[PDB]
Amino acid sequence: PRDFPIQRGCPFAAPAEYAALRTDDPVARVTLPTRREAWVVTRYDDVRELLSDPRVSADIRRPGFPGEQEAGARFRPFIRTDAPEHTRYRRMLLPAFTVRRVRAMRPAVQARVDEILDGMLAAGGPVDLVSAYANAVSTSVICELLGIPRHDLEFFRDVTRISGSRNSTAEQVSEALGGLFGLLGGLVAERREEPRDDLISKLVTDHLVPGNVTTEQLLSTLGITINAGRETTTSMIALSTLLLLDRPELPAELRKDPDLMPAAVDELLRVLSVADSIPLRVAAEDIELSGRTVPADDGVIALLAGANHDPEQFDDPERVDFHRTDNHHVAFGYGVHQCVGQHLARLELEVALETLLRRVPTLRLAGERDQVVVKHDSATFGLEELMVTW
């Protein structure tokens, strides 16, 4: 008779009903919208170790929910394989990802956010954020990641808009795809020749051209790569914003001394924890966890939020306090699955929020609390429309 909660309490996030299911059914049973039964974990350490158990992988029956489906045995998406197929992709790509690398694009991520703003304020209007800033950056961040060039960014921003979201036609969606990959291969072939030092560059030269880089396979992952970031951060940005945006104290601290958003972005990431439902893992075996053991071959997701607001982790978890000692959160992943992406997802996230309140201080909502609208369509969380001016 059981369900998994939207909730989201709204305001801000996210625990919903979980307070009860955190203290008590620490592993309670709950139906998925597909009415397949499965298991759900809500206590910080439960959520984490559970996550990096030896025996927990992704694959065939019976995980997640998307109507549909344990089908397909869609190949790849390697973000739902266990090892040794999944690892050889994950690692195929880490060396690129890293930090020494990620803090490097510090000037180009800055650059880009700045140039996108240049227009924000130039076409003026009381405009929607999510669509306008929020997405804009996100994509373009990832452009800067994959070496995507000059301003064939709308060559790009477009097959994103189309391909990804709401309504097609299937053919004319499938047509979007056509470009994205005309684009990619464009590049995939181009960096074989004059290889720059970006993500196609990394994947092509080191791995591709001499390894099990099979140009079937690249585009695949480059696919799975863009799909990491467009929706998930855009999410974390425009929500993070709306938080700040309606609770002035928060900008406050962040202005007295702007050496914060780092701590802030970690803190928001935790507290917003929009990444909630990680995959879901089928339990490889029976597994002890606060003793209630999870049956061999069952569905078990790990609620990132539930865990992110567990007091066993850190005191007073609702409070968006920025000067916490202790916030080894995991709005990102835990264990060999964890968000490879997140080093970006931080520069994405600070340069984005940072500047919003540098260059455009107190913009405000065009809309009203009572017509702001939160997306809920993917499990990764976000907002449909956010409406502002300055």
Ligand code: HEM
């Ligand atoms: C702030 C926004 C983001 C959030 C909240 C987020 C959250 C997460 C979480 C919780 C996971 C766990 C996956 C698992 O269960 O193993 C994950 C996986 C992953 N993320 Fe992100 N992510 C964000 C941005 C990004 C971006 C922009 C990228 C790159 C485009 C990225 C790359 C990845 C990859 C490659 C995986 C799968 C790793 C693997 O299983 O090999 N992330 N993400």
